Amino acid sequence: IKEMPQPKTFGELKNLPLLNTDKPVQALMKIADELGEIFKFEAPGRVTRYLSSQRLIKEACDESRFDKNLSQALKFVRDFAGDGLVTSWTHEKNWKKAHNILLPSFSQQAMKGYHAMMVDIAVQLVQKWERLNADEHIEVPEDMTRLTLDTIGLCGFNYRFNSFYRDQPHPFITSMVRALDEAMNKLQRANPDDPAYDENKRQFQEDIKVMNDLVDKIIADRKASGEQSDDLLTHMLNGKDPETGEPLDDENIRYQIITFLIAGHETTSGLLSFALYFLVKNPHVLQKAAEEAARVLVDPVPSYKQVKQLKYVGMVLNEALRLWPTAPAFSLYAKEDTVLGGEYPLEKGDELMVLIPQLHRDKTIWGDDVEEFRPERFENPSAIPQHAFKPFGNGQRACIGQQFALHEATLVLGMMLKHFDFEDHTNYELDIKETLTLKPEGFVVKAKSKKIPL
Ligand SMILES: O=C(CCCCC1CCCCC1)N[C@@H](Cc1ccccc1)C(=O)O
Ligand SMILES: C=Cc1ccccc1
Ligand SMILES: [Cl-]
């Protein structure tokens, strides 16, 4: 039994001022590098323990001992994501009900149905880049976010955000991005009831109202038309939970749509951006991935079956998730009094944070080359220790979108590697912006067309 380390304190504010930064996850990674596999983090009226080693995280991933916790970040996001799948407690009726109803929508009949709409958006991205002039560059995270938002809009509720037709966001997205910014900014406020935050509070309620008004209109319009699209909204309007026999109510469907749009905007776009970053920084890996794309993608339009054959592209995506997991943390609570690692006694209700980027750098798991981008690490899942790789979280509360995201990302990256050569023309220095998620900021490349028709 030993005392865990704690980073530097600021009197009555304890550790809170350490998160007064635009890059708090990267700050917590530096603290983990200094203090090791576990540290205490205290703020006024709150304690969490940050875990970084596979040794402790394999225990934390035991669902008999620990359940998903809503981090303060998720509690603030719940003001607009409500009891949707990501901001619900496991014990809330609406978690298991929505999980049971939505699981068939997210399976590997389900990706075959979504494939054609994913191709529609992927083709828009390829045509955009084919149409750039010689002296122009690609803003990578910007274009990847246009793609992933458009894909979830089409697959979510048959709606075209038309992101490739715009410089300026759709009004829903203005409010969504501003609500996500307020939720994350609220984490670093020592005195949140200070009148200096009154405007922030008013704007937040306005953005919540905008998202609720616009999503509630989508649901009403669909019910009125009777239209039966192969989309998540149709599955949610028609689906019955096999346990209760009940469908979701319109309020919960609204929270699920808001949840899916947040995920679609924030997560897959980061993965694609980091994957292209690592490929241009590792030209031998880019060549091996481009050779696979050329051999497999023999038709103008990729098929579902061809995307499943892009094995090396899948490994590239897993190795990008290893080094920069775009959703970089998840939170757990102790279901009962328990001892972590034979060393750290926890009381029922005690909170843990899994620092996924630090887990993914455990040299006792990955070896001395842990900072190197080597997709071959993922050739054999049986050679990877248990709970070493957690970019989609854990257990029954793991990402329901994992297959959807990896299908979209594999399709798009395959088509990108088929259609273009890439140049890191600025020798880009990685700068990671933190919203809900991690994305390269300012990452630009030049694409040279291979002139292969669509
Ligand atoms: O670890 C963090 C900061 C990065 C979370 C990032 C996380 C948010 C969900 C999507 C995945 C990434 N926050 C903890 C501790 C805390 C609590 C209150 C005030 C300040 C810090 C929390 O949100 O509980
Ligand atoms: C962890 C991913 C996530 C996805 C949507 C909303 C909040 C969090
Ligand atoms: Cl102090």
Please report which ligand is nearest the Cα atom of 187.
1
Which token pair is 244? Answer: 């209760």
Query: 72 CB less than 6 Å from ligand 1?
Result: yes
- Entry resolution (Å): 1.6
Q: Is 267 an active-site residue?
A: yes
Q: Where are the domains of the chain?
A: 1-454
206-207-208-210 Cα dihedral, nearest 10 degrees? 90
Smallest CA-to-CA distance from 189 within 19, 309, 23 is with 19
CA angle (32 as vertex; 384, 346 as ends), nearest 5: 85
CA of residue 24 to ligand 1 center, whole Å: 9
Active-site residue, from 87, 274, 399, 404: 399
Give the number of C-alpha atoms closer than 13 A to the C-alpha of residue 7, restricted to the C-beta side.
26
Technique used by the depositors: X-ray
Query: 405 CB less than 6 Å from ligand 2?
Result: no
